[PDB]
């Protein structure tokens, strides 16, 4: 219904739509048989042998094209049948494009965009440009000239080089001045590209394996897109390119990417063009449209036709959507234009078409082609107008299956790629050498490509202009505004001479990239680690895979990132009934070795990446995980991009004296214009991020897929080397199809790949989030700062004019500029895969910290990557059980200084922010501590800033700026008390602030004290956060501190609550002080249901029993403290039974022995379980005389569910069934200790304190009672 006739090549000439036609040519060309498939659109099913007069032969060029894949068939398209296939093929493809809403649009657009008139050396007059026509030869011999938009030719020598070619002029650049000219697309539906995807495994799990073929519809659309631009005369000059660095060993030898092509592809490639450049173009073509309007206006005469000047004028009014007034004066509506231009450049995109054809397609021009296939789309049993290759109701409608070249293998014949495997390369060596193929190298854009005016001041007026992403919804809205008839006519025109004279539009000029290119290097590079993995490749019987390369220098040059365990397991040595055998087992090993997994931003880590590609960074051996936690994703990147946001250009507002309305309109215009700003700066960052960072990650991603392939093949080889030596004989006895084997491992490889995708997904985002975005957010937060000043000085100054609404306006300005607008990636990316990784990364309040101080692999560091430097004092003490626990002494050299990065901190950052840390504060002991306040965390520059301090039973938060003027919150707690929740126990502090509100202080996630800070400030952002005991007048004093954090926002009740449980480690049991409960460490036992008793044994042996007696004493120091004695009673030791866990920390659900210390002899806690009744009376038995008595306890810190709990010890019989939790019986006599199943029942239904709630108290200098 787009192409109304079914043509057969052999159909005879008629001179209307089947005719021999001449074409614009350098000198004489004899004519060719063309078919006019649609009004304005012609097809010449003939190898383009005539448009470029300097391509004589269809033979491969003597020095080859720098193009990853290329194909040469000088016989192709030489017979009739071939042509007739061609004709039908292109036809069908048009119908395929036309069938989609977007295709209907692009296609109409084309037909409609008539090449301008044009030529006329005289102002007043219009003339047609001769090269924009053809001569159509009738049967009888006369010829008639025809106007023409679009010709499809068969291809030139390089068969797959599909181009858009025009004819030129001496003066005019017809494709870049709004004029347009006739497009000649070299094309073929008889071949298509083979590429590899490795991203669709996270949605379609059982996906192909090898290559997938590009749908020829997409390509044809692609070329039409280019045709479109050029017909409207809006193609970007191709001297305008995206220039790459090229000197580094890893950088891509060379590569031309034309801005035009970027825009054209669409999607995320298009996003490499910064805004300042996108606008330049648009303004430029708008102007080039204006000039057309005005030429129109000047024209008073028309030549070379029987048509009407006005008819023709109106042809163009319609093309360029010009606006006509009453007089006939034309002009360009900025608004109307803006849209057309958006549709030609932002809606007609390869990417959008792929949303429409719903096929699998490459995702960035950067996904290099890999091979070439011959296809035949004309038979319906092969490929239909609606489904393309992925035929509905078959095997192929599934996971882009139609497009898998393996799966649909009767539909793609593989071909010779004429570009050799190392036609273009660089040579990388060591102080051995390899060729690495140019196209396997890293793309590294020049900084030159990224411009902006972020630095430009702006004057806000009341006038000032307020703007006002590409969804399928939106396109619909475009489609519907489309008017889909009144198709520009075919009109009769005065004949042009028999031979139209014209040269093709002369391109650059682009030079031959220098060809490897020697590089002598110090490490093995990741290209080298990658060649090791290849072979070989290869018959007799090599393949003995081995780690520690030199592998290279063989074969069996075949390195693997696997363990001896596997390298040993395949370098035997096995027949023959044991092969069957072998195999299975090697499907398991592979799937454990490759499905391997393992911080809070990079949840999922792939350990074996380091060893695969020697990442990279590549100091060894492979504890890659460690290094990745330490430094960030930044270890993956091969080059580290520069993030260069300049000081944002400030606003300044126009005052409109004695006028209310224009003064408020200027404020509102100001505020909104700000909002644009954050978008402006963000977007830029995304653009920078996409091009220099995400690209490197996508290549490693490509490279990890490739190793996994290498490994699979190396295995396959070695299973087949063996198999081949055999029966065989039988041989015809153990039938075994490597298609099943290949079958399994690709499934397998796929399963690993969803992991690695995830992993590197988190990598890219996290990089953007914590080392790109921030450098920008500072600059914004500053621009914000100064606009506020500027706006409030505006209100004060115009205050009489504003009389009635000043407050209403200070509140406006003060709320909008105090809020940190939210980075939404969804606003800058279209991509489901990333958007959902980012959605996952925000969900977690800690990835958003600006300071996050963890001990990792032997250094205290900042996992948030803000902190510039961390100086650790000479006598800072790390707790060797849990190094995150820092001890600070009242030495001036027990101090940790954190110094933040300069261009990341901004003055107004402690105005809405928060801090958390766990502290452990020893009992105050001495009179001088009664009145002595001492700083411990200091953030103050010259009297201004914030600080945390301590005093006798107090934690103190203090704010102060800039010359006044403190506020202050307090947690207060007593030392005269039996058992303290707080004295010398780990407590979790959280401080929140809000410039227009109050400092709040929270203890273990309970709000304590709050006070108004709105009086101020403002505050002075200190570069320095110093952890030190400053001013403590207790020589012997010290504190413990851990997990320090800093947040650029005010944490709410539910956030801090969460924060509270995430850092609690609910899985590990804890002693009374809050430390990790450890095995083989004497504890004094405290029963919480009766805390005024301790434990005792009346008698050792089974005649005896344990019991609670009282009282506990007191401890005291006259005036300072008087608490319950804590080191009393008989001692418990948790002795390991089974574990693993190399270590000493008693975890939830650990099964243990409990020993009881009686008079410095260790005894074992046990009971007779068949003692009639529910409560079993526990005793202390001679460790060896226990026998078959019940003595195994489950250590607990949760239940079930996972409600935490203080019932610690569930006791079990030597069969594994519960007996009871250990507690105490009594209202009857004498509080003996029992295992009571009633507890286990009770905990399910309540969390109340019970007779089984124990706490384990170790001796600690911080409590300091004497035993």
């Amino acid at each position, epitope marked *: 219904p787009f192409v109304n006739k079914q043509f057969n090549y052999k159909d005879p000439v008629n001179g209307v739509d089947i005719a021999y036609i001449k074409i614009p040519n350098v000198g004489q060309m004899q004519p060719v048989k063309a078919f006019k498939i649609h009004n304005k659109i012609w097809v010449i099913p003939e190898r383009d042998t005539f448009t470029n007069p300097e391509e004589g032969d269809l033979n491969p060029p003597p020095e080859a094209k720098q193009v990853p894949v290329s194909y040469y068939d000088s016989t192709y398209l030489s017979t009739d049948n071939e042509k007739d296939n061609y004709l039908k093929g292109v036809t069908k493809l048009f119908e395929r494009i036309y069938s989609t809403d977007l295709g209907r649009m692009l296609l109409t657009s084309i037909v409609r965009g008539i090449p301008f008139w044009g030529g006329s050396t005289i102002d007043t007059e219009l003339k047609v440009i001769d090269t924009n026509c053809i001569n159509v030869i009738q049967p009888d011999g006369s010829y008639r000239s025809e106007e023409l938009n679009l010709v499809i030719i068969g291809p030139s020598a390089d068969i797959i080089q599909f181009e858009c070619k025009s004819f030129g002029h001496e003066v005019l650049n017809l494709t870049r001045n709004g004029y347009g000219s006739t497009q000649y697309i070299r094309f073929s539906p008889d071949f298509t590209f083979g590429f590899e995807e490795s991203l669709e495994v996270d949605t379609n799990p059982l996906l192909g394996a090898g290559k997938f073929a590009t749908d020829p519809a997409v390509t044809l659309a692609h070329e039409l897109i280019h045709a479109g631009h050029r017909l409207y005369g809006i193609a970007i000059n191709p001297n305008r390119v995206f220039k790459v660095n090229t000197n580094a060993y890893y950088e891509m030898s060379g590569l031309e990417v034309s801005f035009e092509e970027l825009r054209t592809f669409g999607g995320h490639d298009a996003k490499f063009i910064d805004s300042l450049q996108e606008n330049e173009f648009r303004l430029y073509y708008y102007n080039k449209f204006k000039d057309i309007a005005s030429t129109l206006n000047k024209a008073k005469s028309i030549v070379g036709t029987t048509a009407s000047l006005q008819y023709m004028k109106n042809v163009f009014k319609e093309k360029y959507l010009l606006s006509e007034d009453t007089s006939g004066k034309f002009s360009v509506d900025k608004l109307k234009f803006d849209k057309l231009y958006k549709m030609l450049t932002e809606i007609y995109t390869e990417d959008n078409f792929v949303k429409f054809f719903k096929v699998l397609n490459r995702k960035t021009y950067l996904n290099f082609d890999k091979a070439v296939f011959k296809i035949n789309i004309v038979p319906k049993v092969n490929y239909t107008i609606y489904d393309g290759f992925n035929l509905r109701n078959t095997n192929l409608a599934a996971n882009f299956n139609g497009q898998n070249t393996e799966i649909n293998n009767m539909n793609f014949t593989k071909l010779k790629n004429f570009t050799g495997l190392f036609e273009f390369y660089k040579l990388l060596c060591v102080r051995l050498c390899i060729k690495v193929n140019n196209w396997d190298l890293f793309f590294s854009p020049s900084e030159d490509n990224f411009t902006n005016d972020l630095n430009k001041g702006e004057e806000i007026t009341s006038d000032t202009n307020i703007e006002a992403n590409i969804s399928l919804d939106l396109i619909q809205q475009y489609y519907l505004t489309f008017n889909f008839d009144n198709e520009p006519e075919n009109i009769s025109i005065e004949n042009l001479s028999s031979d139209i004279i014209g040269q093709l539009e002369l391109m650059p000029n682009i030079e031959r990239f220098p060809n490897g290119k020697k590089y002598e290097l110090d490490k093995y590079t990741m290209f080298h680690y990658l060649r090791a993995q290849e072979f070989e490749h290869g018959k007799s019987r090599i393949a003995l895979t081995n780690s520690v390369n030199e592998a290279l220098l063989n074969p069996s040059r075949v390195y693997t990132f696997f363990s001896s365990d596997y390298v040993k397991k395949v370098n035997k040595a096995t027949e023959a009934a044991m092969f069957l055998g072998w195999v299975e087992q090697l499907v398991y090993d592979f799937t454990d070795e490759t499905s391997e997994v393992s911080i809070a931003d990079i949840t999922i880590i792939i350990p074996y990446i380091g060893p695969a590609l020697n990442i990279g960074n590549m100091l060894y051996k492979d504890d890659f995980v460690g290094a990745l936690i330490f430094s960030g994703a930044v270890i993956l990147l091969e080059f580290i991009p520069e993030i260069a946001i300049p000081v944002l250009g400030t606003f300044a507002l126009v005052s409109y004296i004695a006028n209310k309305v224009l003064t408020v309109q200027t404020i509102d215009n100001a505020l909104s214009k700000r909002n644009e700003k954050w978008d402006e700066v963000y977007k830029y960052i995304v653009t920078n991020w996409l091009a220099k960072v995400n690209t490197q990650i996508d290549l490693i991603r490509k490279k990890m897929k490739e190793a996994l392939e290498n490994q699979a093949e190396a295995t396959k080889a070695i299973i087949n080397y063996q198999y081949n030596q055999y029966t065989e004989e039988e041989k015809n006895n153990i039938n075994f199809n490597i298609d099943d084997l290949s079958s399994k491992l690709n499934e397998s490889i796929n399963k690993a790949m969803i992991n690695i995708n995830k992993f590197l997904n988190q990598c890219s985002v996290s990089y953007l989030m914590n080392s790109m975005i921030p450098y920008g957010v500072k600059r914004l937060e500053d621009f914000d700062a100064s606009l506020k000043d500027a706006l409030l000085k505006y209100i004060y100054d115009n205050r009489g004019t504003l009389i009635g609404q000043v407050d209403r306006l200070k509140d406006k300005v003060n709320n909008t500029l105090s809020t940190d607008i939210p980075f939404q990636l969804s606003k800058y990316v279209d991509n489901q895969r990333l958007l959902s990784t980012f959605t996952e990364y925000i969900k977690n309040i800690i990835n958003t910290s600006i300071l996050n101080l963890r001990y990792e692999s032997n250094h205290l560091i900042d996992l948030s990557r803000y902190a510039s430097k961390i100086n650790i004092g*000479s*006598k800072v003490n790390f707790d060797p059980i849990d190094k995150n626990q820092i001890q600070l*002494f*009242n*030495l*001036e*050299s027990s101090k940790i200084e954190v110094i933040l990065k300069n261009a990341i901190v901004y003055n107004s950052m402690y105005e809405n922010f928060s801090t958390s840390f766990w502290i452990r504060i*020893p009992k105050y*002991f*001495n*009179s*001088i501590s009664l009145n002595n306040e001492y700083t411990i965390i200091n953030c103050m520059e010259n009297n201004s800033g914030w600080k945390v301090s301590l005093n006798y039973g107090e934690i103190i938060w203090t704010l102060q700026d800039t010359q006044e003027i403190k506020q202050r919150v307090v947690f207060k707690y007593s030392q005269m008390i039996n058992i303290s929740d707080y004295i010398n126990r780990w407590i979790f502090v959280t401080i929140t602030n809000n410039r227009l509100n109050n400092s709040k202080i929270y203890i273990n996630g309970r709000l304590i004290d709050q006070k108004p800070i709105s009086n101020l400030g403002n505050i002075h952002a200190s570069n320095n956060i110093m952890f030190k005991l400053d*001013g403590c*007048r*207790d*020589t*012997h004093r010290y504190i413990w501190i851990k997990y320090f954090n800093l947040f650029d926002k005010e944490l709410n009740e539910k956030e801090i609550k969460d924060l509270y449980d995430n850092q609690s480690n609910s899985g590990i049991l804890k002693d009374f002080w809050g430390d990790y409960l450890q095995y083989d460490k004497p504890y004094y036992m405290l029963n919480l249901y009766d805390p005024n008793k301790y434990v005792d044994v009346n008698n050792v042996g089974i005649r005896g029993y344990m019991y609670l007696k009282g009282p506990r004493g007191s401890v005291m*120091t*006259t005036n300072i403290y008087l608490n319950s004695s804590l080191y009393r009673g008989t001692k418990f030791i948790i002795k390991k039974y089974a574990s693993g866990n190399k270590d000493n920390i008693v975890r939830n659900n650990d099964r243990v022995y409990i020993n009881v210390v009686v008079k410095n002899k260790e005894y074992r806690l046990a009971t007779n379980a068949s003692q009639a009744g529910v409560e079993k009376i526990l005793s202390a038995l001679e460790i060896p005389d226990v026998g078959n008595l019940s003595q195994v306890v489950v250590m607990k810190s949760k239940n079930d569910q996972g409600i935490t709990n203080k019932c610690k010890m569930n006791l079990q019989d030597n069969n594994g069934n519960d007996i009871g939790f250990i507690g105490f019986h009594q209202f009857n006599n004498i509080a003996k200790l029992v295992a009571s199943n009633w507890y286990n029942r009770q905990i399910e239904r309540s969390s109340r304190t019970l007779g089984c709630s124990w706490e384990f108290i170790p*001796v600690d*200098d*911080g*409590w*300091g*009672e*004497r035993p």
Partner: antibody
Amino acid sequence: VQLQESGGGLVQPGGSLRLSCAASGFTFSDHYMYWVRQAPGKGLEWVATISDGGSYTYYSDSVEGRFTTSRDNSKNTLYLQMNSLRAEDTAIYYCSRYRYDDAMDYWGQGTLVTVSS
Amino acid sequence: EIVLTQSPATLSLSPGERATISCRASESVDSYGHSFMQWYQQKPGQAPRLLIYRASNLEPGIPARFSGSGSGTDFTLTISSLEPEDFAVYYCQQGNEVPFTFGQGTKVEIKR
């Protein structure tokens, strides 16, 4: 591994004097330093303690506000500034190192200070 | 001002004897599970010499005859078998809190 406290002499009532204890043989910049005095044939007396970094000082009520201690860490020196002296300031003066957190373990010979008209 | 009362006043004793010296504090001398009681031997004309730190620990290179003990407000320095060379003033010192103080000393006199 010693120290070496000099300065002293016959000084007028009302007069002022500077004592200088020099240190070597151990990382000085780490330890708290103490000043202890002993009148001629009488009890020992604690005069001043100064922290490692030199930012915190303690003085016994007796000489508070009259004496000052300070340190020049980069020179391995300790100092005792001594103003408006009284006859009760007559004593031998000993500087000492305090090994954290145990005792004053190392001591100097001690220079003599004498106040009289 | 923690007063360190030290008794006896003087203490004359023939060699190889037992030499109890009793120190005692008006206020506690204990913080962080440590008694901060030092002991000092001072022969005439020489800088005090440390003997026992934290009430109970013997200083490296000091001999066995000296031994510390006590806790809180009641410490005691014993000389397992006196010498002649252990005629000396002996001093207890609290380092628990400022103002650090010394006792007023105990003069070991030798017999014959």
